[PDB]
Ligand binder design. Sequence first.
Ligand SMILES: [Zn+2]
Lengths: 612, 333
Amino acid sequence: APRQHLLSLTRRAQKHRLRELKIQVKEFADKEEGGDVKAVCLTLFLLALRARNEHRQADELEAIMQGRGSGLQPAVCLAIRVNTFLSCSQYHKMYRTVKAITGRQIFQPLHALRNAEKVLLPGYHPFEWQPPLKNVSSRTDVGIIDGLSGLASSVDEYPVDTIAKRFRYDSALVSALMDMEEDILEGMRSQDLDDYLNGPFTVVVKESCDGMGDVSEKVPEKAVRFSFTVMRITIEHGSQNVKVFEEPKPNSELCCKPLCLMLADESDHETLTAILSPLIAEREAMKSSELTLEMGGIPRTFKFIFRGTGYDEKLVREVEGLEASGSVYICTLCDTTRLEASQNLVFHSITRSHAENLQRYEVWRSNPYHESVEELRDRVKGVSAKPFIETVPSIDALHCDIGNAAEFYKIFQLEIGEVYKHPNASKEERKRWQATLDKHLRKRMNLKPIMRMNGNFARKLMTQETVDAVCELIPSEERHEALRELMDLYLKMKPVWRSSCPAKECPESLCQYSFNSQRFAELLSTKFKYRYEGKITNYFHKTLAHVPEIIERDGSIGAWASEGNESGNKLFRRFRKMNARQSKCYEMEDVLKHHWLYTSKYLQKFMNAHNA
Amino acid sequence: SLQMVTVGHNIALIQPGFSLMNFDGQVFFFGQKGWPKRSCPTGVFHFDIKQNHLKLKPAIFSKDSCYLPPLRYPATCSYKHQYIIHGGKTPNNELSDKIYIMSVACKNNKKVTFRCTEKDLVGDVPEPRYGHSIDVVYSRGKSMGVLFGGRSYMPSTQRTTEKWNSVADCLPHVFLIDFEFGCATSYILPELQDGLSFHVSIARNDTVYILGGHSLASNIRPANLYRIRVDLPPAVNCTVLPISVSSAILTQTNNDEFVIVGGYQLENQKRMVCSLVSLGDNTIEISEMETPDWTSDIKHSKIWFGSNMGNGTIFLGIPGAMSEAFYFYTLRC
Ligand SMILES: [Zn+2]
């Protein structure tokens, strides 16, 4: 009744003006859906709200009933802040404004985020090693440490002009392991398991190391990154090794957890070993021990297996003791020569190993059999330097595709000309053929020419359309059919070593792979004799000789590649921009922290919450 | 008198820590950057210094020699004829406890070939180090070796991966080496308890002199001089005498006239001046000569490395606008 509107009274007054209707509704409730007054008023009010097109409000009500939750856990704020690359500045501007306008602290202050960072970065969680690692500190609260690992910087000491930052490999593994705790537990439950099981778990980890390239703005600054990827986690349950986790996209840049960043050249051997060898020490030390780590309030035990496979060819040779030129031993998996592999194309066993390269290097140094340089070079099969990183004898699918394509490119050059007609080495005319080729690729395709070929160019180049388009500069009509068959066989082959699982994804291509390989080889021997006689490229060799053996051994080749976007550079750049321009040291420190957060499965859950 | 010298084909292989050795007129280069390539598997080179230009030609090894890795700060010396090398820093940052012996085994027209023989040791075997000093002594018939330490990595019990590359001057023991027999024995000096490195060693007859270098546990570059003596049935004694330099290189312009060219004076001050050692029989004193005509580049530099040919001339290196990593000089007296 006038003059007091219902929404301004006391709840006594309200309940009294209303009670007339309350008895009506309470009666109604007890009849249809007794005796939940709450549910009835809910349905009513909601209808009344959507009736008047007040949807934002109705949604907020529906949300409130279900327990959410208007603000945001610091963890989610940090997730947002990273995956959108906000500076601390930017974020703070947004925080304070949303706070001010809404009165609610929907985003969290920066110190909150700072904490979420501490929880998610190496050095937070407690763990212990059994037996404790040789030459590694058992001190558990270690996060970021200096890449130089204490290297002498006296003036008369060997010049160190490089900056580097890293994690302790064990600490980093703990962090990575805790980050994906929920993934492990859910894996267990999905395999029908008490998720309390202590283990032991076997964690298969893929190592990889790459040259970032140039990371500057207008002197160039070269950078190098050692990183790992949790590829598989299995558990001992009776007699079988039950798989409780497998990285869905092993080649994504999202699970490539960064271990060490440095400002060096991957060609600069002394400093490279200076920086990486402490990591390797820790790695080895871990090879012979078990990790104890509490998860669901209950301790679990972990064993690791380190398959170092994500390496460029030049770098595999670097770290495994081989001379890195086309001379004369061309394969990092077998003892073949450029000529032997040019004549027997497809029959080669895998025979190299890190262990063997170690033995061989010792033999070359000591020369136990008193031999001449060539006799010795032959006994030791190319291994004249001491390996310092244990790698798996495999193929990086990325650098494989890149290199193969980089060969097809020079093929295209040598086929728009007539090399099987003219044996004349005129370097200038070579540059002319590259000229008209680069020209024509721009016109018929969407191909911007670039030096130092990457994987994108390689993607755009190895298609049948590019064959048709490169055919337009060729006078002969016979070679068109040869190149078409070459390309077709190559593309019949590529999916087998490019796939992360060809036993599932392309089981047809897998079985026919031997035969396709055969036809390819025959086609190289005859129709392309002019280049591939006495000579052959490393990757052609590897492709023909070693793919089926590697697949038999490991299930795939693709899954063990380097990240297929090579965005190490790109990322380093964005992360750099995300902070104040400080002393180059702190700059590095921050890029490492943010790169680490960037690859946390925990935050990624949040950022991918919108379609789960 | 010194002059700018240019290198050509494979300059890149030159690096701080390289060593030079002298054979009957010809100069040879050891300790390249990186492991030896196919273009020269030995890592040892003909050092062709012709008319202010350096060509680095390859060298071959004997059919029975060891193929020693490029050691980076080895203790090197001679023998009356052969060279002694021990030990150093491989290009994998490992420290060699091994002694390699450099003989020459064949001579031809333009080029020659070497013998390279590792002698292993029982002891009292010295700890794998670098920047240290090794020399030869002639007692009451006939010869022995004297090793005074430099620095090395941590003990294999106290070494942590977080401080993996942390070095420290090893014990100032004096190490006596019997080569031909193949054994070593250490001696503690009451007169010596402070470890040194990157110093300068000069010996003759049965006496060995050691000059100012650089300590670590104190960060001090002494100027003190040290004596060492030897007998024969073996024993050793020491005394002290009245410069402060680090990583100095000593040449021989004349007989018993050693020209000690620069190095470093303070942690950021390169000595830039010179000195002359008053040598004699049981009577030696540090004196000073003039100061050479350093160019503008050498003047405003922070880094000094080089080594001696033997004939008073010396080989010098300087860093370095995207043009060249190094610029080199030759210094004659
Ligand atoms: Zn092979």
